[PDB]
Amino acid sequence: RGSGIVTRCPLVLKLKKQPCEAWAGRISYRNTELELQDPGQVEKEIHKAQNV
Amino acid sequence: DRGTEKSVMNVVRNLTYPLKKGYMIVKCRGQQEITNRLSLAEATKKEITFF
């Protein structure tokens, strides 16, 4: 929510249910994948991603 | 140890990779095992036990 936080780049959310334990990752536009493990680390990392 | 290494384990277990003669795991033998050059009977005994 922040102090008015919003998209600075287009943002691609891909969602698929699976019986396997929760996992999220991300992709930077310099052809770098990153492992986020459980999706608690998502919210901050996807703002941090856009910034760079 | 981590969820990171347990995911790789799940992905190899189900054979998503092509290899028709498949996968396997061996222990590497420890740092103390290499120091003394211990008998292979103990390496067999150790290996079977750890898995």
Curated annotation (Swiss-Prot), chain A:
Q: What induces it?
A: By type I and type III interferons.
List locations, semicolon-separated.
Cytoplasm; Nucleus; Nucleus, Nuclear pore complex
Q: Mutating residue 7 to A: effect?
A: Defective GTP-hydrolysis. Disruption of nuclear import and cell-cycle progression
Q: Which domain of life is it from?
A: Eukaryota
Q: Where is this region: G2 motif?
A: 6-8
Chain's role:
Interferon-induced dynamin-like GTPase with potent antiviral activity against human immunodeficiency virus type 1 (HIV-1). Acts by targeting the viral capsid and affects the nuclear uptake and/or stability of the HIV-1 replication complex and the subsequent chromosomal integration of the proviral DNA. Exhibits antiviral activity also against simian immunodeficiency virus (SIV-mnd). May play a role in regulating nucleocytoplasmic transport and cell-cycle progression.
The family classification in the record reads: Belongs to the TRAFAC class dynamin-like GTPase superfamily. Dynamin/Fzo/YdjA family.
Q: What is this protein called?
A: Interferon-induced GTP-binding protein Mx2
Gene that produces this protein: MX2
Swiss-Prot record, chain B:
Inducing stimuli: By type I and type III interferons.
Where, per UniProt, does this protein localize?
Answer: Cytoplasm; Nucleus; Nucleus, Nuclear pore complex
Q: For the region G5 motif, give the residue spans.
A: 27-30
Similarity field: Belongs to the TRAFAC class dynamin-like GTPase superfamily. Dynamin/Fzo/YdjA family.
**Chain's role:** Interferon-induced dynamin-like GTPase with potent antiviral activity against human immunodeficiency virus type 1 (HIV-1). Acts by targeting the viral capsid and affects the nuclear uptake and/or stability of the HIV-1 replication complex and the subsequent chromosomal integration of the proviral DNA. Exhibits antiviral activity also against simian immunodeficiency virus (SIV-mnd). May play a role in regulating nucleocytoplasmic transport and cell-cycle progression.
Write down what this protein is called.
Interferon-induced GTP-binding protein Mx2
State the organism of origin: Homo sapiens
GN (gene name): MX2
